Amino acid sequence: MPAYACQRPTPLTHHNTGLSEALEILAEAAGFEGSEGRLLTFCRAASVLKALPSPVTTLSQLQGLPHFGEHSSRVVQELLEHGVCEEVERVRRSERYQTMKLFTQIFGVGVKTADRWYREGLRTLDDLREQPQKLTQQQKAGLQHHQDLSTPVLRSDVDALQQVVEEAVGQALPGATVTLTGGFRRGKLQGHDVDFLITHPKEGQEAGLLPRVMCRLQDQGLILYHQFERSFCIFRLPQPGSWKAVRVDLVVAPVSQFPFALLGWTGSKLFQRELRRFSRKEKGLWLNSHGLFDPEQKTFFQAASEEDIFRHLGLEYLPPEQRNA
DNA sequence: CGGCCTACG
DNA sequence: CGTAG
DNA sequence: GCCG
Ligand SMILES: [Mn+2]
Ligand SMILES: [Mn+2]
Ligand SMILES: [Mn+2]
Ligand SMILES: [Mn+2]
Ligand SMILES: [Mn+2]
Ligand SMILES: [Mn+2]
Ligand code: NA
């Protein structure tokens, strides 16, 4: 088992969901307490189990696995021996964990904001609504549309949204293209949002595109919220006789950057953090959604595809459906 | 000891 | 701070 | 929390 998640395939369907879900509760709780390092270890340990070929049934099977030390192994041990881990159950049932989960799932609210509200005694969404002066415009939109945004986005919804985004993009710039990214590109059947990457084959033609696309969507009545090259939107998606709010991210990249943006926006989140860590720490190159930089030569790698980027980093290529770390 | 991804809005 | 994967 |  390689130590970095970008070095091994991770499929969408795997064999250790119970164990990985418990470790991911501890990771989320670590984040709520402000320990990104513990969050990362528990995330990495959960991800190792997703890459295993068979169910773990005995603690022996953890020996030598990266990111399993005393704490993560004890969690697995108790799950194998008893079906539950006391620590995980204590976190699950705690008022702090439940409220921090409730608040941070709001669009516009992160850990630091949620923690302040918790310390002020707030506990419910109705508590937040009663104090609207305490909210940014982004948070007001997240709270207003919270019920809809908690409804899984389906492929039906993705296909309808891709059509209206393609229509607006084509009206804004002939020849521009729209690519579905995010979890749906990795094969997920459901999601929390839909992510799209927009470019044009002639470098430079995409300048100014996103405001033009947004104007065109807003005048078709499709936009409930928006705030450039990244737009974090809430769309008014038509449904039979009605509509529902859906989170949509629109991203524009010049075609020279498109492979890097496609790679970054396809995820998973852990996969991409691990890939950037690998790039810098193992290969001495700096990776983001715009490019891959050699800081000694002061040059950017020219990539024509995601495959080119994996090759330049000395990694076996993984298709999107194996990036579900 | 001390890092842990690296951007944009 | 929030957002993104 | 784990590891370079
Ligand atoms: Mn026991
Ligand atoms: Mn997404
Ligand atoms: Mn840019
Ligand atoms: Mn998104
Ligand atoms: Mn230390
Ligand atoms: Mn994400
Ligand atoms: Na949030």
Side-chain angles (χ1 to χ4, degrees), chain A residues 77 81-82:
Chain A
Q77 178 171 27
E81 291 177 13
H82 306 299

Side-chain angles (χ1 to χ4, degrees), chain A residues 100 103-104 106-111 113-117 139:
Chain A
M100 290 292 291
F103 288 168
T104 58
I106 303 163
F107 176 67
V109 179
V111 171
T113 298
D115 168 71
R116 179 174 73 252
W117 290 344
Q139 291 159 355

Side-chain angles (χ1 to χ4, degrees), chain A residues 92-111 113-129 132 135-136 138-162 164-166 168-188 190-191 193-201 203-214:
Chain A
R92 267 187 185 122
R93 296 207 229 183
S94 64
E95 180 172 21
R96 163 83 181 178
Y97 171 86
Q98 286 175 8
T99 307
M100 290 292 291
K101 185 160 191 72
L102 178 69
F103 288 168
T104 58
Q105 283 174 340
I106 303 163
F107 176 67
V109 179
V111 171
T113 298
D115 168 71
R116 179 174 73 252
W117 290 344
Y118 190 87
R119 286 186 288 105
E120 293 170 356
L122 306 172
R123 295 284 184 282
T124 68
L125 304 178
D126 276 354
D127 291 334
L128 302 174
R129 290 174 185 131
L135 307 172
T136 65
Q138 185 182 61
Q139 291 159 355
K140 289 179 165 145
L143 202 57
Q144 179 57 225
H145 298 293
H146 183 268
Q147 309 169 113
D148 279 351
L149 299 193
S150 299
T151 302
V153 178
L154 313 176
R155 283 291 326 199
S156 148
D157 305 323
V158 172
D159 294 341
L161 286 163
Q162 183 147 10
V164 300
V165 172
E166 286 177 341
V169 168
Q171 287 154 196
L173 191 65
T177 61
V178 181
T179 300
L180 178 65
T181 63
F184 286 103
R185 182 171 181 249
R186 303 198 304 278
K188 286 182 79 190
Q190 292 184 350
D193 90 325
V194 192
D195 307 292
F196 295 110
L197 178 59
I198 302 165
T199 191
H200 188 282
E203 185 89 1
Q205 290 293 296
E206 82 302 329
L209 175 58
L210 196 45
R212 287 168 57 77
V213 171
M214 293 307 308

